[PDB]
Structures are given as structure tokens and as C-alpha cells.
Structure 1
Amino acid sequence: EISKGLEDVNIKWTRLTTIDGNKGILRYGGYSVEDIIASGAQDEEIQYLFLYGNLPTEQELRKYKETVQKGYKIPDFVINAIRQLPRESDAVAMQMAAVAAMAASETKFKWNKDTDRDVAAEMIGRMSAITVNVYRHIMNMPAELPKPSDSYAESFLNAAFGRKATKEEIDAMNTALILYTDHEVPASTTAGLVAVSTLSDMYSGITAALAALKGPLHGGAAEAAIAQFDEIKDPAMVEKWFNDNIINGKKRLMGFGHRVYKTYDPRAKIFKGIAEKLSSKKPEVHKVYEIATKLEDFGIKAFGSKGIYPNTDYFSGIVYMSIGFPLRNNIYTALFALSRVTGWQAHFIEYVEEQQRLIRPRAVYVGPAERKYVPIAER
């Protein structure tokens, strides 16, 4: 019978990403994400790694960035797929609308060894363009496109905010990009894999992945976690809130728990370090951080023994808030998606190119036995 939540079912092999959930170890193509972050690698180097299977030389990187910046120009109708929507709309749903627009108009897309990586590189560029325009629309600003610059992170932040981002902001965004690049087969990547396993196009695969990312149990926690801290308002109030909501109210502690990690999420640890550093400079944000660390202590004491620990989404919102993004319209989840689009595409290409099979499971029937079609009077 039933493989609930597909727990421990292997749906593919991958060369892209390994996770040890018991030791809390995450590697991208053999490199620890700690090593990548310490090194100061640019996010484009890690995008290249995902698409090509190795780190690029300076020459390969120059070539790659040129392909990504092709995506910074997007059709007027893709922008308009966003802006023609109401402003109170969820930021991720807005990204879905825009990607659905390309799914629709890219009539020539074909799965092909020779073109897949270039389509994917250009799409990483368009995700930046779409995410800029999602943020501008929500904030009721003019439409704008990212421009080529020293970095993908800088290009994104400069177009989103319409000012020059500082070095510290750019470096934090660059790390955010790397930390959310991929995580093997979470619900979002799985939904996308199901879509591309019918040989539906890359963009539809992204659209499905976004539909799943949106939910509070997955990437939607990037907004729901920080919303808990915002409710608490005052650190003195933490214990009471925690007993009221979590111990006595049976609600889940958002930003804790993971299907795979039964220990502290190694990405959460890095995000926590950045949150502490970036927030301390901003009094309103610093106090959100303080609430979060007090709450975390209670959570770990209550849940640690069940293998339920902070995940990435517990701290990533504070990182985004400190960079300058507001807590509204699930913006934080849209920022997760911007990063994750690289891992989604790399997985879909690996799946379709090398181990293609329709994904089509079964259900256990527990409904009514065969019965004769009843006429209306006798019902």
C-alpha cells in the first residue's frame, strides 16, 4: 500500500546535490556549501556548475554570463502578464503568471542536448527580470529591467530598488542566491519533474514548481516564519506566544522541521550568521532577529529530540528584510524562487536527457463497490 508523502521513495538519480539529513551536510557537485560561501564564489559560478557539471574557468564564465544577460530583456507581454494583475496579489503567483506567459509563447521549445543549457541560462536571466518586475508592481513603481553589471546579484538588486546597492547588500544577496540554488528533490522540484516527465516544456516545468513552492509547508514558510516574529512584537512575549500557539494551540512552528534534515539545516546556520551581522545595523530588524533567537531556543528544547530543528526559512526572511525587501505579498518566497530556478532547470535537464520516464503512480481504492447507475427519483 501507501508511500505517504513519497517518504524515502527515490524518484531519480542525480549528480547535482547530496544531502546527509543525519549529519546536516549539503554538497553541490561535491563542494560543501560552506566552502563555496567562505570562498566568496559568485552565484554565476554556481549556476554554471549546475548546468555544466564543473566550476568554470574565467573564459567559460565570461561566455556564460553573456548568455544569462540575454534573459534580461523580456517581452512587453511577459511584463504585462505581471502588471495587468491586482497589486495585493501573491508575489509567487505573479511569477507563475509571467512564466506561464513564456510557456505559452515559446512555441519553438524542444528538449535537445544541444540547446537545453543555453535555454536554461537565458531563463535564469529572465527570472531576474520577472522578479524585478514583480517587486516593482507590488510596490507600485515603474517597470524596469536588470542591466549587465559586475554581478547577477548586483544587477538584480539595482533594478529592483532603483538605486545602487551597497557591497554588503550585494554580498548577502549573492550568498542567498547560492544557499537556495538547489536541494535535490523537494516538493517544488518534484512537481516540476512530474510536468517535464510528460515532455512538457521547461517553462511549464518551472510554472508547476512555482505552484508548489508557494505553499506554507514549502517555500511559503520564508514569509510565514518571520510573520511569527512580527506577531510576537516583544521578546518578553515569546514564551507565552510559544505555549499559546505551539504547545497548547497545536500549530506548527514555521521555519522548523524538514523532510530530510533531522538536525540543524546547514543553510540555516549560514543564514543565521548573515541575519545577525546585517540586522545589527538596523534597529527595527535587529529586534526581529532577537525575537527569532529567543523563539529558536524554545523550539529546540521542545522539538530537538523529535529531530525537528531550524530550517533555511527560519532566518532567510530576516536576511531579505535587512537587504531592504518588505514583509508583504510573499515577496520572500519569490526571492527563494529566483534562486531555486537554477536547480529546477538543472534537474529537469538531467531527468529528460538521461533517465526520461513518465511519472505516473497509483492510488489505493477505498471507495464504493460496483453499483448500478441509479435513476434520479430513486436517489
Structure 2
Amino acid sequence: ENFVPGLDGVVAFTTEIAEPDKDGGALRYRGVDIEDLVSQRVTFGDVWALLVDGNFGSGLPPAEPFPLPIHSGDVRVDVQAGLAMLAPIWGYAPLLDIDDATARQQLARASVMALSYVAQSARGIYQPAVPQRIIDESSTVTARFMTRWQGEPDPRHIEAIDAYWVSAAEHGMNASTFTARVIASTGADVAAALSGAIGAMSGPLHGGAPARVLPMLDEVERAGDARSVVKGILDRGEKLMGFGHRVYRAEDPRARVLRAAAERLGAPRYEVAVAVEQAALSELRERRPDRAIETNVEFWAAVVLDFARVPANMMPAMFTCGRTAGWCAHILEQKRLGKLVRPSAIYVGPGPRSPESVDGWERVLTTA
């Protein structure tokens, strides 16, 4: 009794990093609203520094040249493995043996190299790399990532990614952030903790499937037939991509800034995407008025990411790129805390028995 498996609602830490007000419909990084950051066009490197350091003192340095050595065919796997291999070649010591400033420099160096590995993996092995002198023509971390990936970077496409990365940078104690904090609490080096957090984010229960709303949006060709299409999908017993039970008590403020960014940047799908949003919401609240139904953040993430020419198989990696900022801030906070996380379990399995009583002992005898 008094037991719900899964630590649901158990307080494990106190953080000073970010506060997601579920009741007030707000998300603030160190007290600053994400809407202020996105509208005022603050780039990812500065939001990374604000979350990790607590102010706008010193941003994010550019990535050094380092051709990706892993080509597994899965962008996630490439960066999970390539990050772990940074510790030997760069001489990363365990967190126990370094001071706070050294951990911050190591976290910044590994974060920006993750973005470089993602861009190289997405560009693919069947293409020559983009020369370093062209990459160096840009001055922001986000612009260099786009140049390294696509060659010529469309400036309006870069602003879409900076909007998306800033709104996905940090969102509390998600499972992949919890994993990074657990690995860091054992004293391991920063690369081992980042690498494990990527493994957690790879799980399909980490969020939504932005790529799945694009085929629906492709069926609707004008704002007028948005109601008719939503009629058909709901009548065929299928599900509506991008809508469900509310996560925030009203709406996710992250869906707000992504939609506003799509309008401000003049994304072609905006007109049709707004029409599908109101069509889907009017229907779902009509067929089942008992549930609080809202637009999920995955819906407007698909519009912003697709407008920036990000393919479907690459959309999960673009979320991981942004979340490195939250991961690094929690790793640095876990280091200063200095307390190993170590929960408990309760045994309910079989009582004491002899090996001969177990089924299969005969095989152990015949073989051994």
C-alpha cells in the first residue's frame, strides 16, 4: 500500500534552472519568459549560457574541426557513440576530480560538438564536407550548424531553428534529463552523462511525432477544405495528429511561440495549418465535450521544422540538439549538489530454495 510504481509525483531535487508553470501557462528560463527570448531574437548560444550560468555573461564557443567517425545509419546512434568517445581523446576526467569551471568548459565543448556531429550525419557520407572557411563566414552557433549541413544557409530558415531550439531547450525533469542527472551523480565524466541522456530521448515515449502531422497537412490544399478532411479522418476511426489532452492547464506556451514564429517568418503552410488547428479543435470539443483538449506542441513544431527544410527522419535529432542546453545546466547543478541518487526496491519474488528445486537443474547437470 501507499505505492505507485514509477516515482510519479515524488520530489527528487530542487532546481534554480527553469520553472514550468503548468497552471499559469508560462515557461521561464532563470525567470525570463521564452516568448521574450524568441521575439527579441536571442540565439541558441546565449540561451544555452543563460540556462547553464544563470546570466548572459559568456555564450557558446564554435565547434572545432572534427570529422564524425561514426556512420551507423541512425543520427541518434552516431551522436550517442561519438560523444562517449570524446573523453579519451580530449582527456576528460571524472566529475569528482575537476572543479566547477572546468566542467563548464567541458560541457560547452561537448555540446557544440554534438551539434556538429548531427549536421554531419544528416548531410550524409555520399557528399563532400562543407569547407571550414565557408562555415567560418557565420557568427552564431545556429548559423554554423545550418551551413555545415546545407551549404548555403537561408537566413529565414536559421531564424526558424533558433526559435525552435530556444523553446525546446529546457522543460523540467524529463526522463532524459533525469538520466543525465543520475549518471552525473555517480561522478562520471560529462561525456558519459550526455551520451546516456541521448539514449533516453531515443525512446518513443519521450514526446510526440512531429513528422506524423505533415501527411495530414499535405492532404489539405486550401483553408476551405480543412473541415472536410478533418471530417474524413475522424469518421474512418483514425486519430488526429497533433491534438490531445492538455499538457499545460490551458495550452503549452511552447506551441504559442512556435505558431507565432511561423506567422512572423511567413511560412507557406501557416494559412493551411491555422485552418486545420481550428477545425480539429472545434470537432474534438464537439464529439467529447468532457475532456480538456488542446493543440500539442508537436503540431506547430512540424510546421517550423518543415519550413526550415528539415526532413522527417531528422526531426527527432533537432529536438535533441536543443535540449543539450537543459542537459548541461542540470549536470552542472547535480555536480555542485554532490549526492548520489540511489533509490530502493522491495523484493516480492520467490523465497529461499535450493538449486535442485529450480526448473531446469537437470540441464545444468547433463551439460556441466
TM-score (norm 1): 0.80
Distance in 2 separating the partners of 1:308 and 1:337: 27
Tell me which residue corresponds to 1:326: 311
Which one of the candidate residues 234, 240, 246 is aligned to 1:242? 234
- The answer on whether the counterparts of 1:128 and 1:156 sit within 8 Å (CA) in structure 2 is yes
- Which runs of structure 2 are paired with 1:38-57 in the superposition (5 Å)? 38-56=39-57
2:254 maps to 1:267: yes
Q: Does 1:108 align with 2:95?
A: no
Counterpart AA for 1:210: I
1:226-237 equivalences under 5 Å are: 226=214, 229=217, 235=226, 236-237=228-229
**C-alpha separation in 1, matches of 2:64 and 2:46:** 18
* Alignment length (residue pairs): 350
In structure 2, the CA distance between the partners of 1:214 and 1:309, relative to structure 1 (3 Å rule), is farther
Contact 1:289 1:318 in 2 (8 A): no
Q: 1:113 is matched by which residue type in structure 2?
A: D
Separation of aligned partners in 2, 1:93 and 1:245: 35
Shift of 1:300: 5.5
Q: Deviations over 1:184-206 (max 9, x none)?
A: 21111011111111112211211
Structure 2, gaps ≥5 residues long: 364-368
Comparing 203-212 with 364-373, greater Cα deviation is found at 364-373
Q: Which amino acid aligns with 1:365?
A: Y
Q: Does structure 2 conserve the Cα–Cα contact (< 8 Å) formed by 1:188 and 1:210? A: yes
Write out aligned runs for 1:245-324 (5 A).
Answer: 245=237, 256-257=244-245, 261-276=248-263, 278=265, 280-281=267-268, 287=272, 290-291=275-276, 294-299=279-284, 306-307=291-292, 309-324=294-309
3-state SS of paired residue (2:204): coil
Shift of 1:312: 2.4
The residue correspondences of 1:1-379 to structure 2 (distance < 5 A) are 1-56=2-57, 60=58, 64-65=59-60, 68-69=61-62, 71-74=63-66, 76=67, 79-81=68-70, 83=71, 85-86=72-73, 89=74, 91-103=75-87, 105-111=89-95, 112-137=99-124, 140-144=126-130, 146-147=135-136, 149-166=138-155, 168-219=156-207, 221-226=209-214, 229=217, 235=226, 236-242=228-234, 244-245=236-237, 256-257=244-245, 261-276=248-263, 278=265, 280-281=267-268, 287=272, 290-291=275-276, 294-299=279-284, 306-307=291-292, 309-327=294-312, 329=313, 331-353=314-336, 355-373=337-355, 374=357, 376=360
What letter is aligned with 1:346? A
For 2:286 and 2:333, the matched residues in 1 are separated by: 41
Larger Rg: 2
Tell me the TM-score normalised to structure 2 length: 0.82
Deviation at 1:210, TM superposition (A): 1.1
The residue identity in structure 1 corresponding to 2:21 is D
Contact 1:265 1:311 (C-alpha < 8 Å) held by counterparts: yes
Aligned identity (percent) is: 24
Q: CA deviation at 1:276?
A: 4.4
Q: RMSD of the TM alignment (CA)?
A: 3.1
Alpha-carbon distance in structure 2 between the residues aligned to 1:229 and 1:372: 63
- Inter-CA distance 217–377: structure 2 relative to 1 (3 Å threshold): closer
**Alpha-carbon distance change, 377 to 184 in structure 1, aligned in 2, over 3 angstroms:** closer
Following superposition, the deviation at residue 290 of structure 1 comes to 4.7
Q: Distance in 1 between matches of 2:287 and 2:184?
A: 41
Judging changes above 3 Å, is the alpha-carbon distance between structure 1 residues 155 and 141 closer, same or farther for their aligned structure 2 residues?
same
Structure 2 contact 83–191 (Cα < 8 Å) conserved: yes
Contact 1:219 1:333 in 2 (8 A): no
CA contact 2:183–2:196 (8 Å) conserved in 1: yes
Amino acid at match of 2:339: R
| Whole-angstrom CA distance in 2 between matches of 1:321 and 1:198 | 39
Which residue type is aligned with residue 152 of structure 1? V
Deviations 1:65-94 (A, max 9, x none): 4xx21x2422x4xx021x3x23xx3x3233
